[PDB]
Design a binder for this molecule. Structure first.
Ligand SMILES: [Mg+2]
Ligand SMILES: [Mg+2]
Ligand SMILES: [Mg+2]
Ligand SMILES: [Mg+2]
Ligand SMILES: [Mg+2]
Ligand SMILES: [Mg+2]
Ligand SMILES: [Mg+2]
Ligand SMILES: [Mg+2]
Ligand SMILES: [Mg+2]
Ligand SMILES: [Mg+2]
Ligand SMILES: [Mg+2]
Ligand SMILES: [Mg+2]
Ligand SMILES: [Mg+2]
Ligand SMILES: [Mg+2]
Ligand SMILES: [Mg+2]
Ligand SMILES: [Mg+2]
Ligand SMILES: [Mg+2]
Ligand SMILES: [Mg+2]
Ligand SMILES: [Mg+2]
Ligand SMILES: [Mg+2]
Ligand SMILES: [Mg+2]
Ligand SMILES: [Mg+2]
Ligand SMILES: [Mg+2]
Ligand SMILES: [Mg+2]
Ligand SMILES: [Mg+2]
Ligand SMILES: [Mg+2]
Ligand SMILES: [Mg+2]
Ligand SMILES: [Mg+2]
Lengths: 49, 172, 48, 185, 159, 58
RNA sequence: GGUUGCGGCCAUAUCUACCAGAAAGCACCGUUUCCCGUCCGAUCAACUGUAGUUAAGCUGGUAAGAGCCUGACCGAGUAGUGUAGUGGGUGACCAUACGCGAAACUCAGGUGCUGCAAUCU
RNA sequence: GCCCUGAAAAUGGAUGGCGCUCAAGCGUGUUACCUAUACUCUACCGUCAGGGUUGAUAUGAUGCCCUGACGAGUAGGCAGG
RNA sequence: AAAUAUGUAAGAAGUCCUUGUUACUUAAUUGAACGUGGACAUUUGAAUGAAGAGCUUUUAGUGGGCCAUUUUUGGUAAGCAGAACUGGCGAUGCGGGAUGAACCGAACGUAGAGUUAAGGUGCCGGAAUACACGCUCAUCAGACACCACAAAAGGUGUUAG
RNA sequence: GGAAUACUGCCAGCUGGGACUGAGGACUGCGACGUAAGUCAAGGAUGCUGGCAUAAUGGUUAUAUGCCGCCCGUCUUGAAA
């Protein structure tokens, strides 16, 4: 997994530099994952949310 | 809306089989982080082309650093803004070392003098003014005269302690 | 299945603060709430 | 705080022990909770629970009812288990052999079963013979056959029995019970 | 005082579609209905018999009966804190096969088939629908598409 | 004295404590209101198929 | 491809005007003994297919034609709207943030498609 | 934009008070700091749940033991005292 | 002709093949229903969650409500009267709004340590008489949501356009 | 042309100061370091030293000081009224 990671990240970096080099723009994949933190307490909340 | 950086934002409409390769549009946006800058990109694009970010994508976002961050320049600033009772265009001048430095004083100045918060202003153009005396505005021309010097009368030093055993002076 | 096996993470309040005068506006508007994108790491790290 | 999604401190709605104070029953319970815990065997888990049931939920199993179950294909030699009491029934004539384990036999039921060459076992006796419930047939009385339940769900068009104390024409048979007297039900 | 007749509040609901008044075309009478079919109810106010009450306008249920001129439909209606089961006798002018049960049956076939070619190749299938996924990396080129840069525009009156 | 006249206020809070569940679905549902001729013939159809199923057990 | 009978969708099929139509069909068209209906064989009924005609119907063409249809980063991401703030404003009201998104307008293109059966230089 | 006029009510008096004028005022930006019965970690009380254990072997099997979570309350219901 | 709200579906009670029953139905073993026998279980037919799901009986209190944002009717208006959805108060302390049923924050076993919220940090009072660019001088300045009001109209005050 | 630095981010990089806690009670578990026997910071604190006796310390009580604290019961949308 250390390798997987290390080379995915590196890959993306070089992708970008190559596009630049070709006069193109690399556009990154949209994020497949998020972390969400609830920051409002628990009173007065509308049913749907 | 803070300590400003300036970004190139480049975006486009999503590809269709009908139009792969749709045209690319760029804006220079002043904002403090890139989440704001892309927001701002879409806010303007939506007022200028049919596109919502749901039909478009951002292709590139890149910070543009000041080229000569210690040459002093005089900048022309063009601004559109809302007052409590209408909306106005306005040309002002700012003397500074970087666009990013200029723009930030623009925002403080719109706040001080016209009570314009950030939501209410659009930066229309910002430009180094090439030839001195294309400078139009007194309060910047004043600084452009030859062998300019001035004193700073009445100097107040801040004191580190609450009592002082001598009556201070303002002498500079 | 993996994610569900993980109980909800119980974070503390952020150590160092929220960095804005008011949480209940959007991150775009001066802060907390909504997608702050990459900047979630800094926030979660101070909460963790 | 916590946005609770479910009642806090809710207690399972189930008996955990018999409400009875009969020492002997507690002992049958003490037996079965060892058995239930220490063997696999679904059987004891079932018999464990049934020991806790209140009287309304142990309706009696009758001796003809055992006769009938014994006529199931491949059932004739099973030992039939009633976690409750077995009652006599003058309605079957030919009654077969088998071994019935129950909480209680009425006198006629013991007689009947015995006379036909069979055997009456108590639950601990059934335990030793069948620590895992091997070759048993658990039987249950008709619970909704009770008089109380005739009146449940009483309402317009429900088909239920009023709680009447005294019956005949002249008691609750006129307005609202026939088209000729106001409406019908 | 107040007024709550049977067709109360129905002026726009039972009206006919603009430039679509008159005879109802025969397709309506040629559809066949089966017990267990899923129909959508929608009143045709030009046919006053066999007409759904207005609560059922826009609602979809299951056919439970078929008759000379009508289908019986089962609708589940909420009254209080509980759905009650309701049965309606609608004439056919007021009913229409539910189009989504059709996509569904079509897909069930498609599914059986996808399963077949997969087994008669002995491979994995994957038959359930995924939702729209994030979007993978791309390289946009600039050949013929050097980005055009835009700026905000000055206020102006057009009046 | 006049008093309040109507409101729904609180009524959905109340319906949703224990509330809504759904229909009570069965295979083999109520034949209530189904065409009498039809039913009368379904009877005979079912009797017959039962008959034969038992006929195929000798 | 034409035409007829029975249609599906029900103006891209309707409307106005002017042209054009071989062949077959369809039509108009001749007749009044009969069944049948009229103030009136006009309609409706019957009879011949015989005496006649494409005039009309009908089909298609024309038209910076009326209407209808379709498209469009045409207008307009506008109007309106779900959600957010101890945002602005004396207020009326307005701006921003995450989203959804019209109508009229303008311009471009189009003006029936089709199922069954029969028949035709 | 700020400021000034327009701007009249009754006991003496209220940006909360003092007082503050390149503010301790108005607009805006940036850091640090103070602080709730909230959040994080830990002890203890109780409630609920799940689990183990009289197999022969001293003193409670409605017991002993292990583990996780939870705790606002009028009218009112039940429980243990 | 929106937005928000709203109905149904996303399969084992399913699919396919074979051919049984009837008094219904068809010109017609033709359909319609219900079935026998045979085949198909890895993703079996989107997502996320499930603190277990389903069910029965019986009985308390209540049946004056009120408030806020938004929609909204009557009224010049009202701390007025009347509806819509949600969230609150009532039944509820705690931290902030000096004060205060209803606003902001946040809901509560007994405690220790840490961190924050809303709100604050001259002194009263815990916390920079912090940093930065302006603007403002009032012989009636001004000073913070709900909130404890101010307008038309004027100024050669001063600012920027 | 060749560097540096800032900014942002990563390290299963090394270290200093301060504060609260120390539940548990033979052994069982997962490991780590050792060539090894052994060792360990690895399923919850130990070790060394000292201090106190008509006392260190703790409970109670009175009083002062800081901050806080309206009269209960009742009906009520709303009671310190
Ligand atoms: Mg923006
Ligand atoms: Mg917009
Ligand atoms: Mg404006
Ligand atoms: Mg603007
Ligand atoms: Mg809020
Ligand atoms: Mg967001
Ligand atoms: Mg043809
Ligand atoms: Mg068709
Ligand atoms: Mg005649
Ligand atoms: Mg005539
Ligand atoms: Mg004639
Ligand atoms: Mg005729
Ligand atoms: Mg004709
Ligand atoms: Mg014709
Ligand atoms: Mg023509
Ligand atoms: Mg035209
Ligand atoms: Mg809105
Ligand atoms: Mg809003
Ligand atoms: Mg403000
Ligand atoms: Mg507002
Ligand atoms: Mg608006
Ligand atoms: Mg507007
Ligand atoms: Mg979004
Ligand atoms: Mg549309
Ligand atoms: Mg077209
Ligand atoms: Mg056809
Ligand atoms: Mg034909
Ligand atoms: Mg305001």
């Amino acid at each position: 997994y250390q390798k997987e990671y290390e080379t995915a990240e590196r890959n993306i970096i070089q992708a970008k530099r190559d596009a630049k080099a070709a006069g193109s723009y690399y556009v990154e994949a949209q994020h497949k994952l998020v972390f969400v933190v609830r920051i409002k307490g628990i009173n007065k909340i509308p049913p749907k949310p | 809306m803070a300590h400003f950086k300036e970004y190139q934002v480049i975006g486009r409409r999503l590809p269709t089989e009908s139009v792969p390769e749709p045209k690319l549009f760029r804006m220079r946006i002043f904002a403090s982080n890139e989440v704001i800058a892309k927001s701002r990109y879409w806010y303007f694009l939506q007022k200028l082309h049919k596109v919502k970010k749901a039909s478009g994508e951002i292709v590139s976002i890149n910070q543009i650093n000041e080229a000569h961050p210690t040459k002093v320049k005089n900048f022309g600033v063009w601004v559109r803004y809302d007052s409590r009772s209408g909306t106005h265009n306005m040309y002002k001048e700012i003397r500074d070392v970087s666009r990013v430095a200029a723009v930030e004083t623009l925002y403080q100045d719109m706040a001080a003098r016209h009570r314009a918060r950030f939501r209410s202003i659009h930066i229309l153009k910002v430009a180094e003014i090439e030839k001195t005396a294309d400078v139009k505005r007194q309060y910047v021309k004043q600084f452009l005269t030859k062998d300019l010097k001035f004193p700073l009368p009445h100097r107040v030093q801040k004191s580190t302690k609450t009592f002082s055993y001598k009556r201070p002076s303002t002498f500079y | 299945q993996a994610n569900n096996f993980l109980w909800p993470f119980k974070l503390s309040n952020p150590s160092g603060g929220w960095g804005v005068p008011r949480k209940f506006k959007h991150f775009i508007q001066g802060g907390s709430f909504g997608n702050r994108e990459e900047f979630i790491n800094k926030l979660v790290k101070s909460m963790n | 705080g916590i946005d609770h999604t479910s009642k806090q401190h809710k207690r399972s709605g189930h008996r955990t022990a018999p409400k009875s104070d009969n020492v002997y029953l507690k002992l049958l319970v003490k037996l079965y909770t060892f058995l239930a815990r220490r063997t696999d065997a679904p059987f004891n888990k079932v018999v464990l629970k049934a020991l806790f049931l209140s009287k309304i939920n142990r309706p009696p199993v009758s001796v003809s009812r055992i006769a009938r179950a014994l006529k199931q294909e491949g059932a004739a030699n099973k030992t039939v288990v009633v976690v409750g009491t077995v009652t006599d029934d003058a309605r079957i004539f030919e009654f077969p052999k088998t071994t019935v384990a129950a909480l209680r036999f009425t006198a006629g039921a013991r007689a009947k079963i015995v006379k036909a060459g069979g055997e009456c076992i108590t639950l601990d006796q059934l335990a030793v013979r069948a620590p895992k419930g091997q070759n048993t047939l658990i039987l249950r009385g008709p619970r909704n056959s009770r008089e109380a339940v005739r009146h449940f769900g009483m309402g317009p068009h429900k088909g239920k029995a009023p709680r009447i104390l005294s019956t005949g024409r002249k008691f609750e048979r006129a307005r609202g019970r026939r088209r000729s007297k106001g409406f019908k039900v | 005082g107040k007024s709550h007749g049977y067709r109360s509040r129905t002026r726009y609901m039972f009206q006919r579609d603009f430039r679509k008044h008159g005879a109802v075309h025969l397709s309506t009478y040629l559809k066949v209905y089966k017990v267990g079919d899923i129909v959508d109810i929608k009143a045709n106010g030009s046919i006053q018999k066999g007409m759904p009450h207005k609560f059922y306008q826009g609602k979809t249920g299951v056919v439970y009966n078929v008759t000379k001129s009508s289908v019986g439909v089962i609708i589940n209606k909420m009254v209080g804190n509980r759905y009650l089961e309701k049965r309606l006798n609608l004439r056919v002018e007021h009913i229409k096969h539910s189009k989504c049960r059709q996509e569904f049956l079509e897909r069930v076939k498609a599914n059986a088939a996808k399963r077949a070619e997969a087994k008669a190749q002995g491979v994995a299938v994957q038959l359930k629908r995924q939702p729209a996924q994030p979007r993978e990396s791309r390289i946009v080129s600039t050949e013929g598409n050097v980005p055009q840069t835009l700026a905000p525009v000055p206020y102006e009156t057009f009046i | 004295a006049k008093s309040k006249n109507h409101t729904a206020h609180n009524q959905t809070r109340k319906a949703h404590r224990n509330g809504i569940k759904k229909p009570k679905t069965y295979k083999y549902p109520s034949l209530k209101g189904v065409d009498p001729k039809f039913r009368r013939n379904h009877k005979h159809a079912l009797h017959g198929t039962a008959k034969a199923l038992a006929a195929a057990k000798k």
